[PDB]
What we know:
The structure holds 3 chains of a larger assembly.
Chain A: E1 4-7, E2 10-13, E3 19-25, E4 33-38, E5 45-49, E6 53-54, E7 62-67, E8 70-75, E9 85-90, E10 97-98, E11 102-106, E12 114-118, H1 122-125, E13 129-139, E14 145-150, E15 153-155, E16 159-163, E17 173-182, H2 183-186, E18 192-197, E19 205-209
Parallel strand pairs in A: 2-11
Antiparallel strand pairs in A: 1-3, 3-8, 4-5, 4-9, 5-6, 7-8, 9-10, 9-11, 12-13, 13-17, 14-15, 14-18, 16-17, 18-19
Chain B: E1 2-6, E2 9-15, E3 21-27, E4 34-39, E5 44-49, E6 52-59, E7 65-69, E8 82-83, H1 87-90
Antiparallel strand pairs in B: 1-2, 2-3, 4-5, 5-6, 6-7, 7-8
Chain C: E1 3-5, E2 9-12, E3 18-25, E4 34-40, E5 44-52, E6 57-60, E7 68-73, E8 78-83, E9 92-100, E10 106-110, E11 114-118, E12 128-131, E13 143-152, E14 158-161, E15 170-172, E16 176-177, E17 182-190, E18 201-206, E19 211-216
Parallel strand pairs in C: 2-11
Antiparallel strand pairs in C: 1-3, 3-8, 4-5, 4-9, 5-6, 7-8, 9-10, 9-11, 12-13, 13-17, 14-18, 15-17, 16-17, 18-19
PDB class: immune system
Keywords: Beta Sheet, Antibody-Protein Complex, immune system
Organism of A: Mus musculus
Amino acid sequence: DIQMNQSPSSLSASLGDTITITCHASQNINVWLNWFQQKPGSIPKLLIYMASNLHTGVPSRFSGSGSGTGFTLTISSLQPEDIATYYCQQGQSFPLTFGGGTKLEIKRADAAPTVSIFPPSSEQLTSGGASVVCFLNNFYPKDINVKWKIDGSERQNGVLNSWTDQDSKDSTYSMSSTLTLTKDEYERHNSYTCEATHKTSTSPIVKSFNRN
Amino acid sequence: TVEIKEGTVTLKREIEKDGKVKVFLNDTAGSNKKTGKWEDSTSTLTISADSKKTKDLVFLTDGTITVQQYNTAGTSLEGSASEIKNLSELKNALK
Amino acid sequence: QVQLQQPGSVLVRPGASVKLSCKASGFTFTSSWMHWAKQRPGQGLEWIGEIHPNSGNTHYNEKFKGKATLTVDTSSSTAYVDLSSLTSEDSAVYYCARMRYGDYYAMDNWGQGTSVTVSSAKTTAPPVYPLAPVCGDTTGSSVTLGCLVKGYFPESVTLLWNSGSLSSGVHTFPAVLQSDLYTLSSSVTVTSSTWPSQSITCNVAHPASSTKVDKKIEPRG
Lengths: 212, 95, 221
């Protein structure tokens, strides 16, 4: 029962760079190894079979080598469409096993997020509900903390955060933050703030509103 | 030359009388069909079922024949090779 | 060209069982080797097994032996997997693929995958709310609008702006779960000179509840 280990587990590289991804197996498998590519929310795609042969349709900038217990995938002149998770798989003996996968990210310069705050919609209030949402678009790196403040007082519970995968166009990330509370609660205060702390500023980025 | 037939599988073995044996395998079926790759360098005939390796047939000079099966994955040989006795035990290798 | 058709997603209760199909075309089915694999969110790929359609012979991954059973139907060129007494650990995407041997020995063609949910929660339609900016106009070079889709369980929902017309400057966020209910949102950014004179609408479709909605982002003031 062959175990496959990949290294690195994730990596950041610049466009045009040449990266390497290595896979190691528990026991000799001689050349029975494959490489697959999977883009976010898509299906696996065959890249290389029998550790070094290219599969039709695949750019020649991809190549693999090795045998025994070590195999490395080489990707030269990194392109924006290479943003994927890569996996190695041994077909030496059943059951077939895959490595943990290596996630690839394109490295770029820092970029402050463009923030927007939205008051509850007229309709949602007509049902006892009240959600305040804050979008934080096109920023980098991914790491970012969002904080909500009602009348200057922070709020922890009721917060729902979501992130998109890295954009292949500009290499940025976007994030949505939604604060849900009852209509009574909403109409008990008037100031709603959405603060964002990012590497791109010592002082936090702020956006809020009241009722007028 | 000798020609064995089992179902839709035809196995032909012939010596070119100067001391050179060469085995040919043919199957007429369109599904689960057998095919063979002959390696004259070791006088080994590898049988595949629908492109998947299954058994190795070594026709040595000693006159005898051996058969060994691949693992379920169809990549490597298992256990140890055995010697074929009669054509009743040889017709099975072609099923 | 080789094609493998699989249904998009299915909902099933705990303890119950489910039948997954994979219709093949583009090659000789009885002359193939079909495989199944599963992938749970961010966890990776696990191999389930292989079946030789011409006989029904199978090879299983011991950790699935009692859980999954592979079968086929030569007359309709379809492969199946039956999962019994499901649990939460069974929620995942299941893929069918064609393994080609010869000089390859690799699965070179995969199906789209069937997302499977094992929950005892009930199907609920979603309320879509329009997100228009706050009081006033007069602002730069762009303005951002939003659409909030809250309170639905039968998970996949499809969203777009202007029936697909407007597609540049869109950020749709992955839905998160909470109390057996999903919340999803989407933002669109346009020029200050196009809204609100040119109308913008988000269209929301939710297959499981057979819901279809169009919401016009009206200005508040």
